[PDB]
Write a protein that binds this ligand. Structure first.
Ligand SMILES: Nc1ncnc2c1ncn2[C@@H]1O[C@H](COP(=O)(O)OP(=O)(O)O)[C@@H](O)[C@H]1O
Ligand SMILES: [Mg+2]
Ligand SMILES: [Mg+2]
Length: 322
């Protein structure tokens, strides 16, 4: 193991992405990782006017005909439908018509009018996604429907990147896709990795504290990471598919700790829909999954798996308990 890792940085999917590998001799696995990330993102993205992705193709054939898709996309949509069901539809990968409408995080983001929202809500229904395992085809049942895999793409890509790493016998590494961290192995000095917990009020990278972790995903969401501002008001990018407006409750930010990064992303949105007290309860129903919640009043909560493990460093915040 090396003290200083092999490191590469890029800007993809609208975020800074960095990979670090500490195993001597494996510098070329960084390119294998970024290659994989780029291949997955090209299949998944809807927001490239120059290329038609598999997701784009599914969307343009809504109500028309099923679409042959690759194993990567078929798999990701299957998992998205499970998270959709498991969430009670507060998370729904068919939110596409609604997220296209606000298009938060792009220079043309806007607050649509209620009448425009009302027109797209009847299109949001994960149950209208028709999978065929035999054919490996995906069919949206009604015209107008749009898939949006945004809320699970970085988790899936992280896990797929780790698979690339393990295939090349990488043992110690850090994968950072902006709002997703995976830490593999331990620090070369033998300690667990000290994972920063994001300060939801400050730019990405600022932290309120550290959580020691090894071989774990940490996924972070917050009310200010991608948002729109108009008339002195803020609209973040995690939308209520039943309302058309961003979830409004006491959560400022949440970091979810799990074995798989996709479960991190997956569980993120149903957690936002439930608030602090309800989101902790939801997370307590999932074995091997925990969370640190940060409320709008700057108080910090741990689920049972994590109780007493977060090390708070920012005095503006305070540990609290239900
Ligand atoms: N309720 C929802 N269910 C499913 N997907 C959503 C929902 N709201 C927004 N999305 C899509 O998923 C993305 C949110 O992903 P998330 O992981 O929470 O943010 P980040 O990209 O900062 O990690 C949005 O940008 C949008 O494309
Ligand atoms: Mg997510
Ligand atoms: Mg994410």
């Amino acid at each position: 193991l090396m003290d200083q890792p092999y490191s590469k940085t890029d800007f993809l999917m609208g975020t800074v992405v960095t990979l670090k590998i500490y195993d001597k001799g494996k510098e070329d696995v960084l390119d294998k990782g970024f290659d994989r990330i780029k291949d997955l993102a090209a299949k998944i993205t809807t927001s490239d006017s120059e290329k038609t992705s598999e997701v784009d193709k599914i969307n343009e054939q809504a109500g028309k005909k099923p679409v042959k898709v690759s194993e990567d996309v078929y798999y990701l949509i299957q998992e998205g439908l499970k998270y959709s069901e498991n969430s009670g539809g507060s998370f729904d990968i068919t939110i596409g018509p609604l997220t296209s409408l606000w298009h938060i995080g792009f220079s043309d983001a806007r607050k649509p009018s209620q009448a425009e929202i009302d027109a797209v809500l009847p299109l949001i229904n994960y149950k209208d996604v028709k999978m065929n395992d035999k054919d490996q085809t995906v069919y949206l049942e009604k015209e107008g429907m749009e898939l949006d895999l945004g809320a699970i793409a970085k988790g899936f890509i992280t896990d797929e990147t780790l698979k690339v790493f393990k295939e090349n016998k990488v043992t110690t590494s850090i994968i950072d896709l902006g709002g997703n961290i995976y830490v593999q192995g331990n620090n070369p000095n033998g300690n667990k990795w000290n994972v920063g917990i994001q300060d939801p009020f400050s730019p990405r990278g600022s932290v309120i504290g550290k959580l020691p972790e090894s071989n774990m995903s940490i996924v972070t969401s917050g009310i200010y990471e991608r948002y729109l501002e108009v008339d002195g008001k803020t609209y973040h990018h995690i939308l209520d598919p039943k309302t058309g407006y961003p979830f409004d409750n006491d959560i400022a930010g949440v970091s979810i700790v799990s074995k798989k990064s996709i479960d991190g992303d997956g569980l993120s949105t149903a957690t936002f829909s439930k608030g602090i007290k309800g989101g902790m309860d939801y997370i307590e129903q999932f074995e091997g999954v925990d969370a640190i919640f940060i409320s709008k009043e700057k108080k910090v909560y741990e689920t049972s798996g994590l109780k007493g493990q977060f090390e708070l460093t920012d005095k503006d915040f305070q540990m609290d308990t239900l």
